[PDB]
Ligand binder design. Structure first.
Ligand SMILES: [Zn+2]
Ligand SMILES: [Zn+2]
Ligand SMILES: [Zn+2]
Lengths: 188, 111, 161, 56, 64, 227, 196, 175, 93
């Protein structure tokens, strides 16, 4: 019988301000944590075509430029779509596809990436309140999800393979020079 | 098999009550004590056969270096199988074969 | 398709020996060394640091030097009269010279103080014959004959004295 | 293949010198010859030391 | 069984070196450090894995 | 395709080819490249507006700190439990060397259920004063690892009625291991934490709401920019 | 990682681990606790990967019994720090810092060098102890020393790299000594004279 | 010698899970993944991973002198990019069951004709053969997991002067 | 006496092969241990041949006693003679 250490009964009258949520989970407070691959990026900012066009960067290194092009075309984005009725709606370029076997897949454009789910116990999501120095829990992270390319013929996999193959091909650190006199002349 | 403490995860050593005459598993790092179910405190095997058939994996049929026979499977009666000798590598180990089917993947003998 | 005969296997082996040769491991290892290993060894410990808390008005002075790029050249020969010229392995064999090339390192000096630099010759590295840094790598068959080098010679060795 | 105890798998040469050895038999025969050379070149020093002690 | 060993430790009161002797008794789980010049005695408990360095470190911690 | 115009055209091409989840025929038209299996259901992938102001951390228990393994603790807190889903964490650090986390929960099932129901139904501007008392349970040792990139990890929540999927950023990962309190420090331990903590639910202040809206203005400026 | 004790001799079959810059061997449980995993059950979780194998658990039991005397991370690090071959008389906190240094670095350096990354080191220690137990319980033959896939060949590249590393360190020490001597005169050295 | 960073990137891309997310009780059937002797993670479908790594190496995406070893018995998957490993080349036999060319060499008379010409029909040398997937290098450690035919005549199933070949009758079939 | 029990299962086949009797083993244990240990033995006809023991914190003491018993209980034979073979010798007489 391990007796309870704390018996003072002192209590803090701390009140936390909470804001309404735009959405509420139904039936289960479950969320899936997904690791972000190198070929996928998240752009929470709304898509602005003119700054996007004006900020394209060109580098001499073909591998870095190809990697930037691949991650840019594969980046998850969203933008405001003007409805035909005059209203404004949120439009995204990313979708989730579930097959007949029950597996899930993340789709951006024509690219499809499979999801591998691993069950995790005692894993939860919390919200940090730094101004009060306490952590408030949000929900449970039951499954960990990894993103895997669907096939070899996918353009993302081929571009990644090309970039990684040609990245390690370039290796030249020492630079040649021409000696016109005896090197020891400076010393003497 | 030995159990662990449910509160501080240490080993549960057996203990005997003089007044109560009971076998109890007790953690020496706390006062936790749980009643033992069986009196088998210790067992030592001078000659053992464990690890002979315990070295089995579920993907052994994908190994191309293993020989393939046509022995009959006891469960699903397949006509293809993969055999190998004992995974234990002592000097006294027998030369008997263990067969693995390519459908049910169970280990069976020929005797 | 059609079956593969033993003559096809010998054609494949001939392709192998046409591409690689017989001393490819030596030359490839030396080329890897000269190309990257010297720079990595220099950058292993790239910062020498000397400090002096001078009190003689406390002035904490740190003196530090950084190592930069490695520069290599083709092997050269320096005569007693002071002139220099390009060296070739036959001359090194005949005159008991060493077939080696100078190595230059960029040293940058900074003078840190708190109150509270060009190519330096660091030595000569012997050059493996017929490697990427040898003079005979480029020479074709005719100039190889003019340089008194045998075209059947394969390289993969050094000329010391 | 794994777990092969047949004569050809463990170093039995069924051909003659006139007929010619197969590559596996060639390698096994080379292993045996290497054993012979090592055995001679290793036992020579022990034999010489024994002979010297006997003479002295 | 008491074990007496000559140690090369330094006394913090007399400052003489090589005048420290460690006496540990595993039966009673005790360890005694005596200074051959200062005649001071330090006592500290010892365990089954104890070594003279353990008692020396305990003495250092006690001194400060 | 290094032309910026080509990249922009590819972006609009990807944007235009989004399949409507309600369009069953177009969903069945889509075929897995390798599995050759037709699609069943679809969900839109959208970010979350109301949660970007807050800071989220993935909290995990390492080893014996598992709640399922601790059978008496699990029995006391209930064999998903609303007490676990409404627990409080209080990081207190006496010094850089010594650090731990304080865990609090609601022992009563009815109070925890009422608090969870009230918390999960916040869509209006009326919040009842639920003076819920939290009881200390156990303390654990903690370590923290930071993410170099902002959206290194993201948790996905679903919404079947709207056919959407909302994701939230993860700032860092917190790992907890069981800590055995030294008997010589229990006197200082008793003066650090508390036996009970009372939580009062109140409407957020106007200034704090404006600050949170200003923080959210980085993501969504159409519906939250100050005028 | 030595396995002391002969079959049916020497009482318990303790497992002691040799560590760099440490004068005497250390039982596996103490160093495991020093890395930062105290509970014995999780030590067995790291070492063994199948709970039904009672024989390896029985062989680990003497190590648990010997290491039961230590029960905290900090005392384990201190015990590491006493034997760390450093200067005699170092204080307890400095001993603990020295143990932390000699544990983070120079203990399996090929895995990692940064702080707070010792989980992989604990898993690798469990893997090594598992291999030692698997060989000790006659479940696998000892490793073939003469196997050619476990050998490496050093060509001109690596040999010249090792030689150049030694010579460059000598040249750097000479530059350091000349700089120290020259700062006495307090002159703006050309730096083309320090290099030999 | 080759850098190991692209290898780790490829492994993490194809579903490898790090050590911090690993529980030995839960993962009673996962495969340990080693890279240059460093245990870096685990995986639960090693077959797809080894197939993908081998296909990438045969296509030139990974350097041809990288070792890809799968120990099925010990549930390990080892990768070596170290310097100093001795290797030799071998022909590749099409081992895909779903393919029609199963049990046959990948190299054909078209490859031999291209090698003799010296160029492809819209320089063609040894490296072209290596990066086309008809030849690959194996070291001594990877040789323990492969099955090698001595001659191309061995791929398909009473003279007193001709040498005699082994029967190899212990197995009903050979792949 | 103590509640702790010590029973050991002996292989029937090798015990019969060596041509040994359970009573002989019991007398050997009794001689080497006097009355410090109470001993009982199952008869010949038993399905599994067993022989128990009882002593007259002592779990570790019983473990050490069991290890000592397994180590150095000599039933019969000359110490040092590990194995014996039968040989036929051709002798001219
Ligand atoms: Zn306990
Ligand atoms: Zn079957
Ligand atoms: Zn003194």
């Amino acid at each position: 019988h391990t007796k309870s250490v704390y018996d003072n009964g002192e209590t803090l009258d701390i009140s936390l301000p909470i804001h309404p949520k735009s959405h509420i989970p139904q039936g289960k407070q479950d969320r899936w944590v997904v690791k972000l691959p190198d070929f996928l990026d998240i752009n929470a900012e709304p898509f602005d075509p003119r700054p996007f066009e004006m900020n394209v960067k060109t580098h001499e290194d073909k591998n870095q430029e190809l990697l930037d092009k691949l991650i840019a075309v594969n980046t998850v984005r969203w933008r405001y779509a003007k409805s035909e009725t005059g209203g404004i709606f949120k439009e995204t370029n990313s979708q989730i596809i579930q097959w007949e076997d029950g597996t899930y897949s993340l789709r951006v454009g024509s690219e499809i990436f499979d999801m591998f789910t691993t069950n995790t116990d005692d894993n939860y999501l919390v919200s940090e309140h730094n101004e009060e120095g306490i952590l408030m829990t949000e929900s449970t992270l039951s499954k960990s999800v990894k993103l895997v390319p669907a096939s070899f013929q996918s353009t993302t996999h081929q571009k990644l393979a090309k970039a990684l193959s040609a990245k390690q091909k370039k290796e030249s650190y020492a630079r040649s020079v021409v000696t016109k006199e005896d090197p020891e002349e400076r010393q003497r | 098999s030995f159990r662990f403490c449910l509160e501080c995860n240490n080993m549960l050593y057996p203990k005997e009550d003089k007044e109560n005459q009971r076998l109890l598993y007790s953690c020496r790092n706390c006062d936790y004590t749980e009643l033992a179910e069986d009196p088998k405190v210790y067992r030592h095997e001078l000659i053992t056969n464990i690890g002979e058939t315990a070295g089995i994996v579920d993907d052994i049929g994908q190994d191309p270096t293993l020989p393939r026979s046509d022995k009959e499977c006891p469960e699903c009666h397949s006509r293809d199988c993969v055999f190998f000798q004992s995974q234990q590598r002592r000097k006294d180990t027998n030369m008997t074969l263990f067969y693995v089917c390519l459908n049910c993947k169970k280990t069976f003998r020929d005797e | 398709d059609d079956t593969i005969t033993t003559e096809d296997c010998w054609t494949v082996i001939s392709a192998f020996f046409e591409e690689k040769g017989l001393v490819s491991q030596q030359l490839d290892s030396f080329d890897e060394f000269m190309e990257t290993s010297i720079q990595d060894l220099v950058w292993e410990e790239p910062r020498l640091i000397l400090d002096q808390p001078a009190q003689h008005d406390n002035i904490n002075k740190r003196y530090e030097i950084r190592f930069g790029k490695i520069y290599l050249s083709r092997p050269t020969m320096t005569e007693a009269d002071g002139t220099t010229h390009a060296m070739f392995p036959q001359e090194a064999r005949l005159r008991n010279l060493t077939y080696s090339s100078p190595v230059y390192l960029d040293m940058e000096k900074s003078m840190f103080t708190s109150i509270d630099g060009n190519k330096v010759h660091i030595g000569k590295v012997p050059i493996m014959l017929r490697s990427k840094f040898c003079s005979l790598r480029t020479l074709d068959e005719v100039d190889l004959y003019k340089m008194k080098e045998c075209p059947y010679d394969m390289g993969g060795y050094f000329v010391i004295n | 293949t794994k777990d092969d105890f047949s004569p050809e798998s463990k170093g039995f040469v069924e051909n003659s010198y006139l007929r010619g050895l197969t590559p596996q038999e060639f390698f096994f025969h080379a292993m045996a010859g290497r054993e012979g050379l090592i055995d001679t070149a290793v036992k020579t020093a022990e034999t010489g030391y024994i002979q010297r002690r006997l003479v002295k | 069984i008491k074990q007496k060993l000559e140690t090369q430790f330094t006394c913090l009161f007399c400052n003489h070196d090589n005048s420290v002797v460690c006496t540990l008794d595993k039966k009673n789980s005790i360890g005694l450090l005596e200074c051959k010049k200062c005649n001071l005695s330090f006592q500290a408990p010892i365990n089954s894995l104890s070594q003279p360095i353990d008692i020396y470190s305990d003495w250092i911690d006690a001194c400060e | 395709d290094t032309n910026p115009r080509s990249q922009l055209h590819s972006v609009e091409r990807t944007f235009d080819e989004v399949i409507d989840p309600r369009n069953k025929n177009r969903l069945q038209s889509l075929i897995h490249p390798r599995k050759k299996i037709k699609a069943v259901k679809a969900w839109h992938f959208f970010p979350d507006t109301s949660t970007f102001d807050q800071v989220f951390h993935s909290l995990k228990f390492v080893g014996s700190a598992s709640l399922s393994k601790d059978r008496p603790l699990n029995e006391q807190l209930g064999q998903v439990n609303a007490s676990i889903l409404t627990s409080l964490f209080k990081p207190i650090e006496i010094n850089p060397h010594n650090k731990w986390i304080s865990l609090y929960a609601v022992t009563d099932k009815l109070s925890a259920e009422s608090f969870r129901k009230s918390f999960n139904s916040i869509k209006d501007d009326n919040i009842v004063n639920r003076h819920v008392i939290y009881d200390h349970i156990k303390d654990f040792d903690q370590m923290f690892r930071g993410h170099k990139k902002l959206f290194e990890d993201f948790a996905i929540s679903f919404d079947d009625i709207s056919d959407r999927a909302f994701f939230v950023p993860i700032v860092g990962r917190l790992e907890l291991k069981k800590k055995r309190i030294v008997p010589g420090l229990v006197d200082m331990v008793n003066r650090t934490n508390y036996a009970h903590i009372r939580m009062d639910l109140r409407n957020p202040s106007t200034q704090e709401t404006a600050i949170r809206d200003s923080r959210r203005e980085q993501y969504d400026p159409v519906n939250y920019s100050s005028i | 990682i030595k396995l002391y004790g002969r079959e049916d001799k020497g009482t318990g079959r303790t497992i002691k681990a040799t560590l760099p810059y440490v004068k005497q061997d250390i039982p596996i449980v103490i160093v495991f606790r020093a890395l930062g995993v105290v509970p014995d059950g999780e030590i067995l979780q790291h070492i063994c990967y199948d709970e039904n194998d009672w024989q390896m658990l029985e062989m680990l039991k003497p190590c648990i019994e010997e290491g039961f005397v230590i029960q905290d991370k900090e005392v384990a690090l201190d015990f590491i720090g006493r034997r760390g071959s450093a200067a005699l008389g170092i204080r307890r906190e400095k001993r603990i810092q020295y143990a932390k240094d000699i544990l983070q670095k120079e203990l399996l350096p090929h895995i990692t060098q940064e702080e707070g990354f010792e989980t992989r080191k604990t898993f690798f220690l469990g893997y090594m102890v598992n291999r030692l137990l698997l060989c000790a319980l006659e479940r696998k033959d000892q490793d073939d020393r003469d196997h050619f896939g476990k050998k490496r060949l050093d060509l001109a590249g690596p040999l010249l790299a090792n030689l150049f590393r030694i010579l460059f360190r000598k040249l750097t020490r000479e530059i350091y000594r000349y700089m120290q001597r020259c700062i006495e005169t307090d002159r703006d050295f050309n730096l083309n004279l320090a290099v030999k | 010698g080759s850098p190991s960073e692209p290898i780790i990137n490829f492994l993490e891309e194809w579903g490898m899970e790090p050590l911090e997310d690993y529980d030995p009780a839960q993962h009673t059937k996962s495969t340990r993944i080693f890279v240059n002797g460093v245990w870096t993670g685990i995986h639960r479908d090693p077959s797809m991973l080894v197939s993908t790594m081998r296909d990438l190496r045969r296509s030139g995406a990974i350097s041809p002198e990288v070792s890809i070893i799968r120990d099925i018995r010990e549930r390990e998957f080892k990768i070596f990019t170290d310097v100093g490993r001795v290797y030799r080349p071998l022909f590749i036999v099409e081992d895909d069951e779903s393919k029609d060319n199963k049990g046959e060499l990948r190299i054909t008379k078209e490859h031999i004709r291209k090698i003799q010409q010296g160029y492809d029909d819209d320089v063609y040398g040894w490296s072209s053969l290596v990066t086309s997937g008809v030849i690959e290098y194996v070291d001594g450690e990877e040789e323990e997991t492969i099955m090698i035919a001595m001659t191309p005549e061995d791929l398909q199933t009473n003279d007193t002067a001709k040498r005699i070949k082994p029967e190899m009758s212990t197995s009903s079939h050979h792949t | 006496q103590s509640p702790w029990l010590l029973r050991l299962e002996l292989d029937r086949a090798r015990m019969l092969d060596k041509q040994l009797t359970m009573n002989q083993v019991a007398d050997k244990i009794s001689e080497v241990f006097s009355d410090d240990l109470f001993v009982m033995w199952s008869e010949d006809n038993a399905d599994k041949l067993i022989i128990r023991c009882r002593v007259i914190e002592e779990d570790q003491m019983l473990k050490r006693i069991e290890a000592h018993m397994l180590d150095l209980i000599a039933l019969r034979g000359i110490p040092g003679i590990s194995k014996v073979y039968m040989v036929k010798h051709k002798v001219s007489v």
